[PDB]
A paper describes a structure:
To gain deeper structural information on XcpQN012 multimerization, we endeavored to determine the 3D structure of the purified recombinant XcpQN012 by X-ray crystallography. The overall structure of the XpQN012 monomer, refined at 3.0-Å resolution, showed a typical organization into three subdomains, N0, N1, and N2, where each subdomain abuts the next in an N0:N1:N2 arrangement in three dimensions. The crystal structure revealed an axial dimeric association of XcpQN012 organized in face-to-face fashion. The dimer packing is stabilized by the interaction between N0-N0* and N2-N2* subdomains from each monomer (the “*” corresponds to the second molecule in the dimer). The dimerization seems to be driven by the N2-N2* contact with a buried surface of 600 Å2 that represents about 60% of the total buried surface. Most of the contacts between N2 subdomains are localized within the β9 strand interacting with the β9* in the facing N2* subdomain, creating a continuous 6-stranded antiparallel β-sheet. In contrast to XcpQN012, the N2 subdomain of GspD is not in contact with the N1 subdomain. This difference results in a high root mean square deviation (RMSD) (4.36 Å) when the two structures are superimposed. However, a slight difference was observed between the packing of the two XcpQ dimers, due to a general displacement of monomer B toward monomer A. This leads, in the present study, to a more compact dimer with a larger buried surface area of 1,040 Å2 compared to 880 Å2 for the previous structure.
Author numbering:
A (entry chain B): 48 to 128, 142 to 273
B (entry chain A): 48 to 127, 142 to 273
Write the structure that this text describes.
């Protein structure tokens, strides 16, 4: 009996190099189609089981526009008819499920986000600059006990403005009992996510609903 | 110039029959691998554009375990059981508003995704659960506001906590919180609070006090 857990750290390396690492990990030989090309950035500081490794492999394949098909009782890598980095961030002081609704709004159309519940981590696809930002958001989000939130679907306003309005109101103390509460803007769906301790969070909801006129 | 919108109604028909309907719609010839077999149930009461049709095709392919590849300079269907696929159009609010509210009633064996262009959603589940979810959406759509609050129960049990709140509202024991609703997500052990602002805020206070 022997069970291993892997940490992957590949930056700007070839796609065929990552597939090579994966096959050496999983023990599965893949047939790489000649048109398979590209440079991938894959980092996982969290130690992954065999399944969690495979999960991360398919994620990287989908992110870079390829798919795994079963031809002649072996896996074949063919394309599914910009450079995106991939990071596996482990949540330590709460279950991942709690964070997904909160970081999902900072993820674009080109980017992807999915949980690895077994590892209590999440896989993210985005640009190098946005990934360092989202990683920083997670890092700050993990500390808290409560991850209870409120959603405001704006109609009379514009989310980017409405949030800039609220953050200015909190900083100057013009927002009554709002010290310690956060605002997340989802431009895609035009909605606000309200966070922080119960008393504070409730006051921000009243404040933001009054701003929709 | 000429543009079309299709409505598909295929129940218990062969996979190769649906692929045939799709190719006749899209105008793209697909090469089916011999191992591709199965009976599919696909219904869309909402009229779909070419793109929205293709979206629905790939969804059905993923749901039944196949994938589309550009192999040999043509599109090929290769592999990546009582499932149905329905396209439900939301009439009053944008789909984005109702996805967080119905998503908890969707299992692992299923899948839910929005067609924002058609303001509809594609769901894969069993025939019995799909009829249930379809009438949940049909009831949820009527309202104006779909703003909501989430309570992550860290002590109690969601099924109980919700039954507790619904009883408190019916008898009027829940103060200034009329016309509000509670959604239970057992998987994540959390409560979703809905309804008019004033009412919804009172229920949040009521449900947070119940977590001890």
């Amino acid at each position: 009996q022997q069970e291993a857990h892997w940490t992957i750290n590949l930056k700007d390396a070839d796609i065929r190099e990552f597939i090579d690492q994966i096959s050496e990990i999983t023990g599965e030989t893949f047939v790489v189609d000649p048109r398979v090309k590209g440079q991938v950035s894959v980092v996982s500081k969290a130690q992954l089981s065999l399944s969690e490794v495979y999960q991360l492999f398919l994620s990287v394949m989908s992110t870079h526009g390829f798919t795994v098909v079963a031809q002649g009782d072996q896996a074949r890598i063919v394309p599914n008819a910009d450079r995106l980095e991939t990071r596996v961030i482990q949540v330590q002081q709460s279950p991942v499920s709690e964070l997904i609704p909160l970081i999902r709004p900072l993820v674009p159309q080109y980017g992807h986000l999915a949980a690895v519940p077994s590892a209590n981590a999440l896989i993210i696809s985005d640009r190098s600059a946005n990934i360092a930002r989202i990683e920083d958001v997670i890092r700050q989000l993990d500390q808290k006990g409560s991850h209870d939130y409120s959603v405001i679907n704006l109609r009379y306003g514009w989310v980017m403005d409405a949030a800039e309005v609220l953050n200015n109101a909190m900083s100057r103390g013009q927002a009554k009992g709002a010290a310690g509460a956060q605002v997340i803007a989802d431009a895609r769906t035009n909605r606000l996510i309200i966070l922080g301790p119960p008393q504070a969070r409730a006051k921000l909801v009243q404040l933001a609903q009054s701003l929709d006129t």
